[PDB]
Amino acid sequence: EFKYRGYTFEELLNMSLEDFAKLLPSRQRRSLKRGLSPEQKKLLRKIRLARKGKYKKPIRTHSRDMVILPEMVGITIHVYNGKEFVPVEIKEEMIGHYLGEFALTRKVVQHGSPG
Is residue 54 near RNA by the rule CB under 7 A?
A: no
Q: Which of 20, 24, 63, 69 binds RNA (CB under 7 A)?
A: 63
Q: Which of 3, 48, 62, 91 binds RNA (CB under 7 A)?
A: 62
Question: In this complex, which beta carbon is closest to RNA, that of residue 52 or of residue 106?
Answer: 106
Tell me the number of residues near RNA by CB under 7 A: 24
Residue 113 near residue 82, CB atoms below 8 Å = no
Residue 55 near residue 38, CB atoms below 8 Å = no
Give the count of alpha carbons within 13 A of 86, CB side only. Answer: 15
**DSSP code of 72?**
S
What is the Cα–Cα distance from 114 to 111, expressed in whole angstroms? 9
Nearest distance in Å: CB 59, RNA: 7
Per CB under 7 A, residues contacting RNA are 39, 42-43, 46, 56-57, 60-64, 80-83, 100, 105-106, 108-109, 111-114
